[PDB]
Design a protein around this ligand. Structure first.
Ligand SMILES: O=c1[nH]cc(-c2ccncc2)cc1CCc1ccccc1
Ligand SMILES: [Mg+2]
Ligand SMILES: [Zn+2]
Length: 313
């Protein structure tokens, strides 16, 4: 356990910031992840040999899709890490352990398609799981990987702690279903304004961790503009392939997914920042004030999209 992980100076400093980009070197992503677990949870919360084997099995089960890939998994885990490090005392030993793993695992074996497309195509996963289709799959793949010989990073936990951490991970991954986000934020909003929000209420924690998962999952909108803009290209590469596949089933896709309607991209972003990103990070800052930088960066990027529309770039 005397084996620390250390990053080069620039990464060591930049990694603490909400807008850190993990960079184009795939082979450094596992070290970045281990470094985040060690600083977030202690050097003592996982057997390194088991952690390393788990990370490489998780990596192996992300597919080579334009956006919902291994890079996304680590980007989302880094954002969660920035949140946990800026709210040290608000989270239990187990929550910290569970949530970084939840984030690395949250999109396992994603095929590049929405729950909507699964249902319309009539994929087997849509009969097996009627709602949060991909998200029940991702949690399923997580549990499968935990049961591979030498992969149970949670072996040291008491039997009850083990059930607590797998329940934190399960609610965490399900919460990445953006259809569940809207109600979840409205309830948190109401509960914080009426003053009822109580973090000793497990069901209240659940909702808050759900909102953090949405915040970490959407964190491309909180980066520096060139990262945000270039991540949007990869996001649209999947959306447009899905629209192509909708058209192949005889269905007109929503314009966001229709590569004929690229013209409408800037206005689509406006919609999304106003309907989703800004409310998400607004509510998140109200409940966890040290996450304000996510809201500020999101606001700057909305402003950058406004400039794109006004032909100023
Ligand atoms: O970072 C993201 N991750 C996921 C989403 C998303 C959109 C719709 N449904 C589910 C998740 C959008 C963004 C960024 C904003 C964005 C970029 C590109 C296209 C449209 C919106
Ligand atoms: Mg997902
Ligand atoms: Zn995701």
């Amino acid at each position: 356990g005397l084996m620390q992980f250390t990053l080069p100076v620039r990464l060591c400093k930049e990694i603490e910031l909400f807008h850190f980009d993990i960079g184009p070197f795939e082979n450094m992503w596992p070290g970045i992840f281990v470094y985040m677990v060690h600083r977030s949870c202690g050097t003592s919360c996982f057997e390194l040999e088991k952690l390393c084997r788990f990370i490489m099995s998780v990596k192996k089960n992300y597919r080579r899709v334009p956006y919902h890939n291994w890079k996304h998994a680590v980007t989302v885990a880094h954002c969660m890490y920035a949140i946990l490090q800026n709210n040290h005392t608000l989270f239990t030993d187990l929550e910290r352990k569970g949530l970084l793993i939840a984030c690395l695992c949250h999109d396992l074996d994603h095929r590049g398609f929405s729950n909507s497309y699964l249902q319309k195509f009539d994929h087997p996963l849509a009969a097996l799981y009627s709602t949060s289709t991909m998200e029940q799959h991702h949690f399923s793949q997580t549990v499968s990987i935990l049961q591979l010989e030498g992969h149970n990073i949670f072996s040291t936990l008491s039997s009850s702690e083990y059930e607590q951490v797998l329940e934190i991970i399960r609610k965490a991954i399900i919460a990445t279903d953006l259809a569940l986000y809207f109600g979840n934020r409205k309830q948190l909003e109401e509960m914080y304004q009426t003053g009822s929000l109580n973090l000793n209420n497990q069901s209240h924690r659940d909702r808050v961790i759900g909102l953090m998962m949405t915040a970490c999952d959407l964190c491309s909108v909180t980066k520096l503009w060139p990262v945000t803009k270039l991540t949007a290209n990869d996001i649209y590469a999947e959306f447009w392939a899905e629209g192509d596949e909708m058209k192949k089933l005889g269905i007109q896709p929503i314009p966001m997914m229709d590569r004929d309607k690229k013209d409408e991209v800037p206005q689509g972003q406006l919609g999304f920042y106003n309907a989703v990103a800004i409310p998400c990070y607004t509510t998140l800052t109200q409940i966890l004030p040290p996450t304000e930088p996510l809201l500020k960066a999101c606001r700057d990027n909305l402003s950058q999209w406004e400039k794109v529309i006004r032909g100023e770039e």
